[PDB]
């Protein structure tokens, strides 16, 4: 079990640690979160309460460094930073452990909430949708844009999801303009499967991130992106029976913890009702129709 | 984005647009079988493309051979009007290429923007006019020509016929829809207005009479009349 220790906490804020959140208070004896379990990744996220304009936050895997957190008082935000000398990092860590000034990342044991929210999200991916090669962990906000939305302004701090659109190109093969608009599964399969993402893994994991980051940062690009992922797999007539069940396991989960009180922003009316009740895959997405039956039956 | 009343004049400036009607199509008749079900028979059908400056219409027949062995076919009908539309422009000369196409209905939006994907730069529009072009079949010469066609077939015609020599694409466009609307309302009233002075005749090379400038005033207002009169005899009023 791993921690991310905080050498203080001077402004009041909302903390995050994946699906959990606590308040701190103005320089409250606050120096961390313990127990992180090992084998995700993780995102620890902020919101002020002097601004709660711009939620922010930071992906990380505790196997690739020892990470912390500092605020900065010129940059106004709680920054991760890398501490490179392992005995020092441990030291300090220790010290506050025996003082109990971290909270505990507080998994229920038969809870696979988390796991089952990133089971193919990778480090390694998301440093290639959020470049910034120089750190090993990757910031996100509510108001970064994606690729896709500039083309229609800064490129270094881009969301760099892959673009998908469905009047492109590269999504119609010539001559077979109805086919291909009408069902989707050669730019699904040969495409983006085959071509871009190479395996289904990738692809969910990306469709992961992109909702993770719409439900933790509000962030309106990303919701965007989650949307079409779920859109173009619906749409195929002709998808692998193994990436349906594992749709309806992700969606699932998905919907399942998501605030009740964001459904009204986070969810798209027409993606949703065209993907549970006309698309090609109406009926292959049992759990995700009912809890979404149950627990959202306005937008439907 | 969409034409309409406020925006109207743009259909006669220089820049060469074309407009798009699918109603035509595919068409059916509807008829009881042996077993008393229903089913449809195909007739010979057309894409309407209509330049309204220059009254240039480029005519593609639909054959009913195009439907055989084929499913949904009021989907595929628009589908095959988008295919047809691009390849009319593929075919025309970079100078006489359109640089907007608006559709009458705006279920041919998607088709035609995925079929017209090479060329981002021509502007695909729908519009909130409520044009009469369906009533193209009831112009005798474009019906006798589309009824028999064996074949798929591109036919070239000005429905102004010499009208531009003596007035305005504004003017000649509005005399168009008000003969189309007229004849939609009342073919048969419509037709007989057009016809009743037997010495008033349609040139071999022309769609409509030859009638001077104070003919076309009379006619226009027979027809304003018929439009009139049908909105009574429909609504009582
Ligand atoms: O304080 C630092 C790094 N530093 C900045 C100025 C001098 N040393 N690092 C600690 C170790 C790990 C836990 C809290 C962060």
């Not at chain 2, 628009?78 to 559709?103: D, G, N």
């Not at chain 2, 008033?200 to 769609?207: A, C, G, N, P, V």
Request: charged share 25%; aromatic share 12%.
């Amino acid at each position: 079990m791993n921690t991310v220790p905080f050498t203080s906490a001077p402004i009041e804020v909302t903390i995050g640690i994946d699906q959990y959140s606590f308040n701190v208070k103005e320089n409250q004896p606050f120096h961390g979160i313990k127990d992180i379990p090992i084998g995700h990744v993780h995102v620890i996220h902020f919101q002020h309460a002097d601004n709660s304009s711009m939620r922010y936050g930071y992906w990380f895997d505790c196997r690739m460094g020892n990470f912390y957190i500092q605020y900065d008082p010129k940059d106004g935000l709680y920054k991760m930073m890398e501490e490179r000398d392992g005995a020092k990092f441990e030291n300090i860590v220790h010290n506050f452990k025996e003082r109990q000034m971290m909270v505990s990342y507080p998994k229920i044991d038969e809870d696979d909430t988390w796991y089952n929210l990133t089971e193919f999200v990778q480090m390694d991916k998301i440093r290639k949708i959020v470049r910034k090669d120089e750190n090993q962990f990757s910031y996100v906000d509510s108001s970064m844009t994606t690729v896709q939305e500039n083309e229609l302004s800064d490129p270094a701090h881009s969301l760099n999801y892959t673009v998908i659109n469905f009047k492109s190109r590269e999504a119609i093969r010539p001559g077979h303009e109805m086919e291909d608009f009408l069902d989707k599964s050669y730019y699904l399969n040969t495409v983006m499967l085959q071509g871009i993402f190479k395996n289904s893994s990738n692809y969910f994991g990306e469709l992961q991130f992109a909702f993770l980051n719409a439900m933790f940062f509000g962030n309106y690009g990303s919701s965007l992106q989650w949307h079409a992922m779920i859109e173009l797999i619906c749409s195929s007539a002709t998808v692998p029976k193994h990436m349906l069940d594992k749709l309806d396991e992700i969606l699932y989960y998905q919907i399942k913890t998501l605030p009740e009180q964001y459904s009204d922003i986070l969810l798209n009316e027409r993606v949703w009702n065209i993907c549970l009740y006309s698309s090609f895959q109406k009926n292959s997405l049992h759990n995700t129709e009912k809890i979404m039956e149950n627990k959202y039956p306005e937008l439907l | 984005g969409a034409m309409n009343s406020s925006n109207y004049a743009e259909l006669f400036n220089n820049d060469i647009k074309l407009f798009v009607d699918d109603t035509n199509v595919y068409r059916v008749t509807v008829h009881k079988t042996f077993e008393g079900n229903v089913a449809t028979k195909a007739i010979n059908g057309c894409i309407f493309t209509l330049n309204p400056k220059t009254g240039h219409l480029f005519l593609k027949i639909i054959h009913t051979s195009v439907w055989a062995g084929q499913k949904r076919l009021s989907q595929l009908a628009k589908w095959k009007t988008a295919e047809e539309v691009s390849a009319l422009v593929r075919s025309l000369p970079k100078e006489e290429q359109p640089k907007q196409i608006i559709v009458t209905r705006k279920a041919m939006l998607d088709p035609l923007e995925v079929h017209m994907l090479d060329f981002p730069n021509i502007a695909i529009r729908p519009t909130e006019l409520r044009l009469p072009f369906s009533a193209a079949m009831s112009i005798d010469k474009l019906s006798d020509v589309v009824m028999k066609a064996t074949e798929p077939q591109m036919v070239l015609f000005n429905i102004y016929d010499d009208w531009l020599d003596r007035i305005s694409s504004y003017t000649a466009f509005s005399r168009l829809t008000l003969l189309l609307r007229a004849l939609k309302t009342n073919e048969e009233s419509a037709k007989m207005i057009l016809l009743s002075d037997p010495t008033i005749t349609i040139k071999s090379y022309h769609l409509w009479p030859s009638f001077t400038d104070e003919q076309w005033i009379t006619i226009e207002s027979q027809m304003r009349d018929l439009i009139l009169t049908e909105y009574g005899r429909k609504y009582n009023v």
